[PDB]
């Protein structure tokens, strides 16, 4: 029935990255008879012509599932290609509001936990600093909630403003005693943003930043420890539970040396997302093999550019195999709804104020925010 070796493709951005090392380590953990052979391709996540050329080359080669990253430029094209050709895609990148069920998003949504956290602290007037190349769905939700609840939001783009604009914003904020800031961007850009904040601007009295991301301990905030500077971050991956600690210990004591040079010293949560993606792919294919369903290629895939689309028949079943996967990984429970996005996740809200790392509660889809 199912062949022992099956090919999967990868749209990785850079070979010299922690995500590649996590991918290789997670693929090395496979001991089941279903084996995932990897075809990785390294391109910039931009210039959609090159990326659809890579996608068409992988489809002509005959891959089953594709694991990769996308940005705002290539999200629509990848989503349309996967929804039309019925090719299963699994990504750890940001989730979008509109997508077909044949693409799987591993990053949990932060559009509702942020609103609940803002509602917890009784915020009315604040400045929201967002990244343009990240997705404006969260900004849209924040603006809609502000319009409904009569809030004051000062929306600031990172790339649009300059240092003088930052000084004008901060001198306007200092005139009011209760100044409040929300920021949201990737941690690599957020590090430079926070360095800008500490470089000349006071990070002392007031200034309750709410870091809207998935990794709180990822960001080096030791300079934020000077005075005040209360910060409320979200965490998805806990390096204390038995299973994440066991897997991290196995990563520490690995017989095969990983790629790159160093993949530690505050490791990224996207590596955990890549590990979970490999794990869900392996579990889905194992469960599909257990059900005794034929998935053998009846001929050749051909080319993307054909006047009749003619999707492969069992591919929807492949998507079904990607839907009922459920276990516990580094990020916790991995469950998907009908739309194909991750659901029923627990987010640990960690707020620190001049003392240290301390968890104040958690967030669940059904229970909203439960303080602890």
């Amino acid at each position, epitope marked *: 029935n199912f062949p022992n070796n099956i090919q999967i493709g990868g749209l990785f951005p850079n*070979q010299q990255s922690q995500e590649h090392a996590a991918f290789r380590f997670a693929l090395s953990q496979l001991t089941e008879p279903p084996k995932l052979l990897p075809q990785i391709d390294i391109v910039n996540i931009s210039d959609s012509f090159e990326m659809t050329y890579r996608f068409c080359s992988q489809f002509s080669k005959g891959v089953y599932a594709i694991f990769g990253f996308y940005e705002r430029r290539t999200v629509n094209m990848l989503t349309s290609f996967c929804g039309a050709l019925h090719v299963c895609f699994i990504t750890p990148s940001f989730p979008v509001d509109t997508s077909n069920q044949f693409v799987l998003q591993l990053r949990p949504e932060l559009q509702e936990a942020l609103i609940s956290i803002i509602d917890h602290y009784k915020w009315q007037t604040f400045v929201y600093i967002y990244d343009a190349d990240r997705g404006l769905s969260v900004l849209q939700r924040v603006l809609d909630t502000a319009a409904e609840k009569n809030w004051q939001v000062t929306a600031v783009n990172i790339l649009t403003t300059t240092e003088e604009g930052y000084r004008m914003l901060f001198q306007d904020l200092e005139k009011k005693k209760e100044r409040l800031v929300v920021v949201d961007c990737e941690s690599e850009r957020l590090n430079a943003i926070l360095g800008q904040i500490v470089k000349l601007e006071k990070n002392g009295i007031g200034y309750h930043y709410i870091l809207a991301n998935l990794g709180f301990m990822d960001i080096d905030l030791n300079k934020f420890k000077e005075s005040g500077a209360n910060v409320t971050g979200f965490q998805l991956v806990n390096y204390t539970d038995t299973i994440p*600690a066991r897997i991290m*210990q196995q990563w*520490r*004591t690995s017989d*095969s*040396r*990983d*790629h790159t*040079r*160093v993949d*530690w*010293k505050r490791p990224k949560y996207t590596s955990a997302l890549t590990y979970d993606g490999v794990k869900v792919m392996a579990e889905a294919f194992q469960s599909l093999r257990r059900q005794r369903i034929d998935i053998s290629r009846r001929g050749n895939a051909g080319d993307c550019l054909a006047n009749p689309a003619v999707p492969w028949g069992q591919g929807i079943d492949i998507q079904r195999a990607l839907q009922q996967v459920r276990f516990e990984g580094l990020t916790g429970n991995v469950q998907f709804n009908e739309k194909g996005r991750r659901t029923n996740y627990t987010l640990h809200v960690i707020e620190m104020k001049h003392d240290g790392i301390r968890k104040i509660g958690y967030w669940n889809e059904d229970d909203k925010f439960v303080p602890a």
Partner: single-chain antibody
Framework: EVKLLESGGGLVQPGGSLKLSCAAS????????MSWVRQAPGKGLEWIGE????????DYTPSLKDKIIISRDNAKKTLYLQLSKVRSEDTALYYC????????????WGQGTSVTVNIVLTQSPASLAVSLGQRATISCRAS??????????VHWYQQKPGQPPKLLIF???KLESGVPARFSGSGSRTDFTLTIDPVEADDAATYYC?????????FGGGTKLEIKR
């Protein structure tokens, strides 16, 4: 830069159990695993044993595994190796070392102590002596693959007689931290090559090349370097 203390090298009785106290000051074995190695006088170093970062499974020596047992505490950050049926040849220099893969600064071996009770690489030239301000190239030919898992997997460590060893270059992509040595692996490196520019009086030590691609990482004959006056 992590700090490792290893003192108390002295003579012992015939057949008695010896103990070497290795202290990982300012750090713990939880973050990085600690490994002890054994080196004889005028001979290459051999791995006496390895531990785990979680202190769950501890490995032993490839030559005499059951003869020596090493117990380490990560919270106390203290390691002690005991032995049974100790002979004259069994009294070798035992030196601890933190994990080199954690960081280049964390790649700081212990001081090492001696008591009186692999990698096949040829490094040339064996004798080196140049004045301060000169550049020298040393080639370490090996039998295994020049590069393992994309990049190279060979290392060079400069150890002096009576002084603690220091890893100069590791995996041809991360040299020694703290003091950046100019000698590092570069190019295709069919033989492990490192261009030192410039050498100094403190760099008068023997540089041993160990192929980390070939299991296990053991220092070979190496090449000796000095400073000409």
């Amino acid at each position: 830069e992590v700090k490792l203390l290893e003192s108390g090298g002295g003579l012992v009785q015939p057949g008695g159990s010896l103990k070497l106290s290795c202290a990982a000051s300012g750090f713990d074995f939880s973050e990085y695993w600690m490994s002890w190695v054994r080196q004889a006088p005028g001979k290459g170093l051999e791995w006496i044993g390895e531990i785990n970062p979680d202190s769950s499974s501890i490995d032993y020596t490839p030559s005499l595994k059951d003869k020596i047992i090493i117990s380490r505490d990560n919270a106390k950050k203290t390691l002690y190796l005991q032995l049974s049926k100790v002979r004259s040849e069994d009294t070798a220099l035992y030196y601890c070392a933190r994990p080199r893969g954690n960081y280049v600064v964390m790649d700081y071996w212990g001081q090492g102590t001696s008591v009186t009770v692999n990698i096949v690489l040829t490094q040339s030239p064996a004798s080196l002596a140049v004045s301060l301000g000169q550049r020298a190239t040393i080639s370490c030919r090996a039998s295994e693959s020049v590069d393992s898992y994309g990049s190279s997997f060979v290392h060079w460590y400069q150890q002096k007689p009576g002084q603690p060893p220091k890893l100069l270059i590791f995996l041809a992509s991360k040299l020694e931290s703290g003091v950046p040595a100019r000698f590092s692996g570069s190019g295709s490196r069919t033989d492990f090559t490192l261009t030192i520019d410039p050498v100094e009086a403190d760099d008068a030590a023997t540089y041993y090349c160990q192929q980390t691609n070939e299991d296990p990482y053991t220092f070979g004959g190496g090449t000796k370097l000095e400073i000409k006056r």
